[PDB]
Amino acid sequence: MENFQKVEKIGEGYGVVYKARNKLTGEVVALKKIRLVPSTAIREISLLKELNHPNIVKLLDVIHTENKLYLVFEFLHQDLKKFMDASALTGIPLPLIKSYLFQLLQGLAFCHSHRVLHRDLKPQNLLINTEGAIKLADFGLVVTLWYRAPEILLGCKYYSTAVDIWSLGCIFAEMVTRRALFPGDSEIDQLFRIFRTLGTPDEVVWPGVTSMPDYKPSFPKWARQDFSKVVPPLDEDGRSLLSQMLHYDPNKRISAKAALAHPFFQDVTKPVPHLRL
C-alpha cells in the first residue's frame, strides 16, 4: 500500500474508491479499500480475479495486508451517471445507447454463465472509456433502490441472475428518457412506483407472487400502463426488449443471452462517445 499514491476519491462502493498511482510502475488505477478479514471473503474475492471479460472492469490485484483489503482495478475515466448527466440536454444518441446495452448484456451473459450475479447494477458502477467500451464494476458479494428487482424488494432470499436484467432494463429506460424509471426513496415507495407503472403483480402474471415473504394481500391494486407512455422515444424493438427485461416473473424475464439475439440489436454498431474528461 505504501506502493500507491492516492490522487482523489472517486466513489463509494463495501468501501471507498480512489484514483491512485502505483509509485513504482507509474500505473494509474482505481483502488477500492474494503470496509474492515474473513477466510471466506478472501477466497471468494480471489476467484473474481479470474473472471475476466472485455466488459468487466479488470481486477488487477487483491492486497490483503493487514486487516484491510484493497482491490486494485484498471482505471476508467468516467461513469455512466456522469455521462448521462453531461448528455442530459440532448440525450445519449440511440446508437450509443444500443452499443452500451449490448456490451453490458455481453458482460452479464458471461458473469451469469459462471453463476456470478452482480446484484447492484446502477449508472454509478458502469464505467466508460474513450474508445466506446462500457464495463461492469463493483460486483457485490444513502443506498439507491431505483434499480432493485421486485423479487428482492418482496423478500426473496434466493434470487437469480434475473435481478441484473431488471436493473439493466431500468438503466436502458433511463438512458432513453433521461429520467430514472422508478426513483423510490424507500422499499415500499420503490415497490409502489413499480406497481403504479407495471400494474400490481398477481398470480396470473407472476405465479407464486402472493407467497413471497413481504407480499401483502392489502397492497393497492394498480392497473398496468402502456410502454408507449413509459419510454416514448424508443422504437417498438427497444420497447419489446425492455418489456421482456422488466417481466415481473424472474423465470419469464429475458436472459442476457436471449436478449443479445433480440431484433433490437440487428443494427448494433460501436460508436465512440464524446467525453469531456
Ligand X SMILES: CN(C)CCCOc1ccc(Nc2cc(-n3cnc4ccccc43)ncn2)nc1
Residues annotated in a binding site for Mg(2+): 125, 138
In the set 120, 189, 202, 249, the catalytic residue is 120
Known binding-site residues equal: 10-17, 32, 74-76, 79, 122-125, 138
Is residue 235 annotated as a catalytic residue, yes or no? no
Residue 183 CB, nearest distance to ligand X (Å)?
A: 19
Name every residue whose Cβ is closer than 8 Å to that of residue 163 and which is 6 or more positions away in sequence.
Answer: 117, 119, 148, 149, 151, 152, 250
Residue 126 CB, nearest distance to ligand X (Å)?
A: 9
CB-wise, 76 or 246, nearer to ligand X?
A: 76
Within the chain, residue ranges assigned H as helices are 39-48, 80-86, 94-113, 150-153, 162-177, 187-198, 227-230, 236-245, 256-260
Name every residue whose Cβ is closer than 8 Å to that of residue 75 and which is 6 or more positions away in sequence.
Answer: 19, 28, 29, 30
- Rounded Cα distance between 58 and 72, Å, is 9
**Contact positions vs ligand X (CB under 6 A):** 8, 10-11, 13, 17, 30, 32, 57, 73, 75-79, 82, 124-125, 127, 137-138
Q: Strand 78-79's sheet: what is its strand order?
A: 78-79, 126-128, 134-136
Residue 21 CB, nearest distance to ligand X (Å)?
A: 13
CB-wise, 144 or 240, nearer to ligand X?
A: 144
- Rounded Cα distance between 262 and 36, Å, is 43
Residue 13 CB, nearest distance to ligand X (Å)?
A: 4
Enumerate the active-site residues: 120
